[PDB]
């Protein structure tokens, strides 16, 4: 079915690839040819995903992993059952992502709007190839991707942050928390903002948007703006990803494996203006 | 439970947020149903019973505004449920075709909504969007290029017309759109900015929507110094239409 | 976007008259600093 | 293009603001226009409204950041010199384990238990100054009690969890560096704080808040040219462009939000990052005190 | 003397006032407080 | 900086707030008399 | 004195020290509570 | 004559002297009382 | 010297005036009480 | 011209002026009794 | 010489010069405080 | 350019340079009784 | 003329002129008082 | 002769190759000082 | 360019280059003195 208004839109045109043999869509879902590739990737990778569960222990959702293969590998294709089924996994995701966002590019092409969402996904899936092709490509062996598990991952983070003393001490790493911290801000402020603006005090009518610049420079100082406002999100939440994936690129490529982000820091503390 | 039990505190206060926070999203995705419902079922399907999902929409939300006046979601009448539009194909989720012309019918990407035929009146119930002839205090800021002048060329490099006045938006300083006189029929239609590269790449504005003699079709404002929200959703539509059924032979 | 055009060719016209000086006067910096201390020794040492 | 800039820029007049209810005082009036900040947004930056409650609320704040860098000086001989080399790895640390929930020595964590006295002050005035400054316009408190759930975590960090533990000596020092490594001997201290399921909470909502903060971000910059920025009036009048946001997300994902329920789903997400955040500390000692021994106990 | 208040506002430099006088002596308690000397509860440590 | 009447209400809510006053003032002190019957503070400088 | 009511609003003088005198109250039993002496539940310690 | 007359400037300056000094006595009878339980100001060798 | 008064508005400099002071007798203060000799409170260390 | 007079500025300058100079006065009896509990600015070996 | 005022504003350059003499009074203080010979307060060390 | 004409601007600079030097006269005055307490600057070898 | 002040207002690029000056000022005599031979504070370590 | 300063408005990109240049001597003095052959403070180590 | 002409910059720019060359003669008096305090740039021996 369709939305109330949504008949005008549902128009022909605008795909990138197939014509119109895939221009349809399922209920809500427009399919086009990277939605129907879309689900074939996520499905094929689920169930590799439940096949390797198949041959593990438990069924067990938060101790499902996938492991990514040994480290005798190296960068090369590991048999199935000894890490194989991780890279398959990983092409799956890869795919199941590009194609999302290819899908997305057509719906944006189809409704006549920018590419801002395909190209703000395409950060998302750069830091997922960082964390599993490019950073263990840089360091010699699949073996230092993350497992595809609930919990595993989470073991992976914690190991891959330890084995760098503390990973606090990540230079980038910190650019990128400060990112994700004022990222979680502005979405608190903005959206208490349209709400306030929105549903306002009992007895009271719906406020304009110069009431949102009055009180936001009142709060921050000064005033950005109903666009202002929408660009800085979008820039704060892809930077923080940015710097994330430049994060993980300069650990283990750069500073060896063993090394320490708490002694990098001693470049400033041993400078001559004080070091004597 | 008890220090040896199996049930603890952690748990169970776990267990307490995912009711609330099952609670929360069908509040949240309930809110998200204020537009857009009853949905309107395809072909093949039958249209006796409504169809509306498994958070059914709230009750029409009554929104109080400034003069006194009242607006209640969902915006029904803005909906333009029927179209100059045929189906592809007699199947469900077949896409349809514009039958007549897609820059007059307003489908697709030049589809409008059925906006109010009034201007936004801001804050001192005058209206924001204003040429600058009318807003007097306001200047383009030299700092940056001067649109007025310029003449507009099209997407196939045929000049459109030539840019006179800026619209700008009072209360939030900034320039909304490009008044052109069309080439040689003494005829003003407004461009908005972004539809428009103001950056004199040669010597001029470009608009790549649409082609030089389509600036005649742009619909125009009724009044002469502001411009309603229908005639706004008019304008951007006019110009999105060309993002898919202009193309103007540029092959 | 930028400036006028008149304002960038006197941009690069003295941007590159004073890079050249900078140039000039880091070499005749340089030559007494080697007459100080010559660097760039030989695998046998200084 | 596309709207990461402006490429005309208008100027005109100072805005004085909406005209405020007989209940606060005459504000500022600097009202000055920087370019770069109208060529990434708006250009005013001002007036401020500064009454009584924002005053007092910079009075407290800087009598705690006074007493932390008047600390942090003592702690290295007043050097300059050694304060600035020295500056990330100083800090205000907190009071020593013996002397429990009492008032310690001033150099044993009795300066550290005035700065936090007077920084959660500060903070509880600044909180008390947005909700004025909200229902002066007569607008909503929506920001103030997402602001109150940032102070429930700081609460909670710096002074719920030390009540319940009964030692000041649990909370963080006031330091760069340090903090930093309060937080990663806590997590080590307490088990692994990757098994606390409310910390794993608030970390799904964190990376939820980014993720929905691009999505909404990149949304209303793609339809930004058929008047999408203006969500107040495509919420009580609906444009296209509201109706193509909705669009995209409906055939994208299957379902949408309107003008002003996504604005909920941000401030909910937002909101409950520090709020599950909060949680997680307070149940962290007194309640688990070894995260992983709970995981292994659960999953 | 009496012309101090020909500039300043009572209203506000009398509220300012008040709340300084109660932080400064909020410290001095503290501080008080803190000490072993001066502690009028639980006085002197060890 | 006038806010509000000028002994119509000045000087009524003055009499009503010296009055609440008053009385918090004197239950404090019953208190703290009984408060001291219960725990002297001020020690000796060796202590109690 | 009553003067001072010229000056001050009677409200929000009244609402400030409604809230100042429950935060001074609290913070005066917070500080018994935490000291031994003059801990009422459960007294003194050892 | 920023914000207020001059009549009401000197009854404002008269009230605020009397409770101005009212304060700074008070202040001193709880120094006295002060320094007679503790007095501060050590010699150099301590108390 | 009065003249310093024609450009700087006597409300602003003398608030600010005011501020400074009591942070440097703060500062002063501190000082003097993080040093063993002129601790007045505790007395000296030792 | 900070929006005040002249002669104004000369009153305003005449009770800052004997503020300050009150204050310095009383500053001074603090410094001296100050030395005389104890004195700073010690020989090169100390006290 | 004295042409100098028409280019900045005394309101704002007689701060800012009085900013950065407090701070630069207060670096060399604390520097001299920092030091072993020339610490007024406690003296000399070891 | 400042809100200000040749004559206020001169007279300023006056009260500045004048102001300025006293200020530096008792800074010189200060140096030189810092250096009857301590003089700095020692040789190679020390004090 | 120099026209470096029509693209930099003096207003602004000699405040930074001089707050770049007394940084560099500010470095070199810490760098001169780390050292053991050009300190002239504690002058001579060893 | 080039022409080409119409993306980078010449104060910003001015500025930021000023900083830099200051940086980077900054950087070749300080590792000059670190070693020992190239210390003109100090003189070389043992 | 900014909102400034060539009516000042003229002999802004002189005035300038005044008072940098003030600021370098009284720079190199400071630096001999420094040299004469202690020489620095010893030879690879030593000072
Ligand atoms: C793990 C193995 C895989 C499991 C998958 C999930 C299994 C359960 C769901 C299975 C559904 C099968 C449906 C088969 C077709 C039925 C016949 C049909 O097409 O009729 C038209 C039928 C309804 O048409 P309509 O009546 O016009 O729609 C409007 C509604 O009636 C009323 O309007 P509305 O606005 O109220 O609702 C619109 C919207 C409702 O909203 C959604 O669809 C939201 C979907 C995502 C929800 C969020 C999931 C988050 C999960 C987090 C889990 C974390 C756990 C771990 C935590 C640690 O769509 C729907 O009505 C439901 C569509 C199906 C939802 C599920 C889609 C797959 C989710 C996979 C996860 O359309 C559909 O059902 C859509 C078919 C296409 C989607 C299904 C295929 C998805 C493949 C995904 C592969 C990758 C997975 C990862
Ligand atoms: C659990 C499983 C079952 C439930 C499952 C389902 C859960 C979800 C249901 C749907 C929720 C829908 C929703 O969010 O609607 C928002 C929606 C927002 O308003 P709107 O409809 O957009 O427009 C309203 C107008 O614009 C007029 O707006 P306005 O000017 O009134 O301001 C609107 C503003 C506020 O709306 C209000 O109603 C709040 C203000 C009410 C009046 C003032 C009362 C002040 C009380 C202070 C108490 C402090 C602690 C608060 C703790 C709250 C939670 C217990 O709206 C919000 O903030 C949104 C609601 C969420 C607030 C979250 C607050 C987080 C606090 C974080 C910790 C703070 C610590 C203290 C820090 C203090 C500062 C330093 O409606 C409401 O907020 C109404 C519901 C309010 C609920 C209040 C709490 C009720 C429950 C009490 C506890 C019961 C359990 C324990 C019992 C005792 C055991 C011993
Ligand atoms: C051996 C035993 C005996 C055997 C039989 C023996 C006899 C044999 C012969 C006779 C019997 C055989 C033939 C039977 C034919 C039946 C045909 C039929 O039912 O067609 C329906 C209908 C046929 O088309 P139609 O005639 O146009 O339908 C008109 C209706 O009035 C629909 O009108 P509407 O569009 O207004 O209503 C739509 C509504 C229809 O659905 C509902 O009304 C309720 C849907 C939500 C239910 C939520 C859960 C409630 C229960 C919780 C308990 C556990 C749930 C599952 C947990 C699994 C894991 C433990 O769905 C929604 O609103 C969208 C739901 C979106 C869900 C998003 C999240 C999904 C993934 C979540 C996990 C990740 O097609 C559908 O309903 C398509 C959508 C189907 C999926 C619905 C959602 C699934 C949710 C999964 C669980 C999510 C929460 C966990
Ligand atoms: C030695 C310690 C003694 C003791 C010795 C004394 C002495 C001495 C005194 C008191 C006094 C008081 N004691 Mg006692 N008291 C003891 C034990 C207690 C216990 C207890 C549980 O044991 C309680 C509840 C109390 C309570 C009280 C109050 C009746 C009274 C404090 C006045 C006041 O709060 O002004 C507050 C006044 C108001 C008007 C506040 C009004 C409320 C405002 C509006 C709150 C603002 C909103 C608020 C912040 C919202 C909170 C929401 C939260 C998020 C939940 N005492 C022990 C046994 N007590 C004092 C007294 O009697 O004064 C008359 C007093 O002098
Ligand atoms: C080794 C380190 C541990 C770890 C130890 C902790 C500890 C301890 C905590 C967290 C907390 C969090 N962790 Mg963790 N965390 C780890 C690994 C991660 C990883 C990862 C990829 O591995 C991520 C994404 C996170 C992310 C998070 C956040 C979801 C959460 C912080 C919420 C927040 O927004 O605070 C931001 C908001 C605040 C900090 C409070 C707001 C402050 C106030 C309101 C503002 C005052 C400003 C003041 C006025 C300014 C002047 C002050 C003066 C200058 C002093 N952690 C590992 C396992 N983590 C916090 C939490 O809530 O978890 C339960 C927390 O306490
Ligand atoms: C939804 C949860 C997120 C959130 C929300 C949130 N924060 C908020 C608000 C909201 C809704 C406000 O309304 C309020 C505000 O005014 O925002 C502009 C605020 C605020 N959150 C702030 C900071 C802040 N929020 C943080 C986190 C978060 N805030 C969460 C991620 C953090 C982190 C991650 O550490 C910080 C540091 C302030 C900018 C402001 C509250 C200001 C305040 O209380 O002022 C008290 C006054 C003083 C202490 C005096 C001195 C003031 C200056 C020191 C201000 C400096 C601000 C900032 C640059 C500090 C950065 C850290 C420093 C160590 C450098
Ligand atoms: C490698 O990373 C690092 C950086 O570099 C990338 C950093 O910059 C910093 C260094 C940055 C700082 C230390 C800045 C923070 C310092 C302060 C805010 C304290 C202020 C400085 C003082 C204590 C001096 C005292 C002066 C006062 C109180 C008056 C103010 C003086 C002026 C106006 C300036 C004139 C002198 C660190 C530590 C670092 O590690
Ligand atoms: C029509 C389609 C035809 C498809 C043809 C297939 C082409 C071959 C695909 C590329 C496969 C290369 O496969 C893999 O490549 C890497 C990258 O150098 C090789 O090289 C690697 O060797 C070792 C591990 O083996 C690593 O530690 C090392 O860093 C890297 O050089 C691997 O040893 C090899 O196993
Ligand atoms: C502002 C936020 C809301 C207001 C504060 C919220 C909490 C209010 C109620 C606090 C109740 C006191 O809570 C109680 O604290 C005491 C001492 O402080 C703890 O008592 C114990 O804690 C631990 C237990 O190992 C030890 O330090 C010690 O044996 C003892 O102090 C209790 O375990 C806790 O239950
Ligand atoms: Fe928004």
């Given at each position: 079915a369709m939305l109330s208004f949504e008949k005008k839109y549902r128009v022909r045109g605008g795909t990138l690839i197939g014509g119109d043999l895939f221009d349809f869509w399922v209920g809500p879902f427009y399919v086009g040819i990277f939605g129907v590739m879309t689900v074939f990737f996520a499905l094929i990778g689920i169930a590799l995903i439940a096949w390797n569960t198949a041959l593990?222990?438990?069924?067990?959702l938060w101790q499902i992993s996938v492991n990514p293969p040994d480290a005798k590998y190296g960068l090369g294709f590991a048999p199935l059952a000894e890490g194989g089924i991780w890279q398959w996994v990983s092409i799956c995701a890869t795919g199941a992502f590009v194609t999302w966002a290819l899908r997305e590019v057509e719906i944006c092409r189809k409704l006549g709007i920018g590419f801002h969402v395909p190209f703000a996904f395409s950060f998302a899936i750069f830091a997922y190839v960082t964390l599993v092709v490019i950073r263990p490509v840089l360091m010699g062996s699949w073996s230092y991707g993350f497992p595809y598990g609930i919990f595993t991952h989470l073991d992976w983070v914690s190991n891959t942050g330890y084995s760098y003393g503390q990973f606090h001490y990540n230079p980038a790493h910190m650019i990128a928390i400060t990112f994700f911290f004022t990222t979680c801000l502005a979405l608190a402020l903005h959206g208490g903002l349209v709400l306030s603006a929105l549903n306002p005090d009992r007895g009271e009518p719906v406020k304009s948007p110069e009431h949102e610049n009055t009180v936001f420079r009142d709060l921050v100082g000064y005033s950005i703006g109903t666009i202002g406002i929408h660009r800085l999100g979008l820039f704060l939440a892809l930077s923080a990803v940015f710097f994330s994936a430049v994060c993980m690129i300069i650990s283990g490529p750069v500073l060896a494996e063993g090394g320490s982000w708490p002694d990098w820091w001693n470049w400033w503390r041993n400078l001559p203006i004080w070091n004597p | 439970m008890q220090p040896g039990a199996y049930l603890d505190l952690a748990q169970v206060t776990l267990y307490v947020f995912w009711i609330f926070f099952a609670g929360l999203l069908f509040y949240l995705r309930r809110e998200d149903k204020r537009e857009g419902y009853p949905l309107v079922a395809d072909a093949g399907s039958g249209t006796r019973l409504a169809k509306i999902g498994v958070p059914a929409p709230p009750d029409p939300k009554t929104y109080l505004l400034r003069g006194g006046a009242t607006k209640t979601v969902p915006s029904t009448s803005n909906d333009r449920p029927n179209v100059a539009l045929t189906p592809a194909?007699?199947?469900?989720g077949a896409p349809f075709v514009p039958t007549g012309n897609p820059f007059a019918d307003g489908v697709g990407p030049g589809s409008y909504a059925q906006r109010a035929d009034v201007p936004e009146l801001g804050l001192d119930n005058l209206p924001i969007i204003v040429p600058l002839r009318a807003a007097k205090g306001m200047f383009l800021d030299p700092r940056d290029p001067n649109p007025v002048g310029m003449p507009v060329v099209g997407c196939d490099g045929v000049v459109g017309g030539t840019v006179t006045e800026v619209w700008v938006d009072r209360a939030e300083v900034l320039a909304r759109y490009l008044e052109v006189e069309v080439a040689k029929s003494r005829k003003r239609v407004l461009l908005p900015v972004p539809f428009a590269?103001?950056?004199?790449?040669?010597g001029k504005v470009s608009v790549d929507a649409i082609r030089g003699d389509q600036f005649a079709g742009v619909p125009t404002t009724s009044k002469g110094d502001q411009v309603s929200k229908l005639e706004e959703d008019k304008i951007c539509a006019y110009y999105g239409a060309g993002t898919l059924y202009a193309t103007p032979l540029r092959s | 976007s930028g400036l006028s055009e008149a304002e960038a060719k006197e941009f690069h016209s003295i941007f590159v008259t004073s890079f050249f000086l900078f140039i000039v006067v880091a070499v005749v910096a340089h030559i007494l600093a080697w007459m100080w201390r010559p660097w760039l020794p030989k695998a046998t040492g200084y | 293009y596309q709207n990461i800039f402006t490429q005309v820029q208008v100027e005109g007049p100072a805005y004085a603001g909406v005209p405020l209810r007989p209940g606060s005082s005459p504000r500022e009036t600097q009202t000055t226009f920087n370019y770069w900040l109208g060529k990434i947004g708006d250009a005013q930056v001002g007036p401020v409204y500064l009454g009584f409650t924002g005053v007092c609320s910079l009075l407290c704040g800087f009598v705690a950041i006074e007493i932390i860098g008047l600390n942090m000086l003592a702690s290295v001989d007043w050097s300059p010199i050694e304060f600035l080399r020295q500056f990330c790895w100083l800090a205000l640390e907190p009071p020593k384990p013996e002397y429990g929930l009492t008032i310690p020595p001033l150099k044993e964590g009795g300066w550290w238990l005035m700065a936090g006295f007077f920084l959660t002050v500060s903070i509880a005035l600044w909180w008390v100054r947005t909700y004025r400054r909200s229902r002066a316009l007569g607008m909503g408190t929506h920001v103030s009690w997402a602001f109150a759930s940032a102070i429930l975590l700081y609460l909670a960090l710096g002074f719920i969890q030390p009540l319940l533990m009964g030692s000041w000596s649990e909370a963080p020092p006031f330091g760069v560096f340090p903090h930093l490594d309060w937080t990663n001997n806590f997590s080590i201290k307490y088990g692994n704080l990757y098994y606390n399921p409310f910390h794993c909470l608030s970390i799904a909502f964190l990376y939820g808040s980014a993720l929905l903060f691009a999505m909404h971000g990149a949304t209303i910059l793609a339809v930004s040219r058929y008047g999408g920025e203006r969500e107040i009036e495509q919420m009580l009048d609906r444009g296209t462009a509201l109706e193509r946001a909705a669009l995209f997300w409906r055939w994208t994902m299957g379902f949408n939000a309107t003008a002003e329920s996504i604005h909920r789903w941000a401030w909910w997400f937002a909101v409950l990052c520090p709020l599950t955040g909060a949680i997680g500390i307070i149940l962290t000692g007194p309640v688990v005190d070894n995260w992983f021994d709970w995981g292994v106990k659960h999953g | 003397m009496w012309r101090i208040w020909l500039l300043f506002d009572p209203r506000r430099a009398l509220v300012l006032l008040f709340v300084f006088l109660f932080g400064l002596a909020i410290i001095i308690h503290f501080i008080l407080l803190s000490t072993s000397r001066f502690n009028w509860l639980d006085g002197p440590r060890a």
């Open positions: 593990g222990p438990t069924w067990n | 194909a007699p199947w469900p590269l103001i950056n004199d790449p040669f | - | - | -």
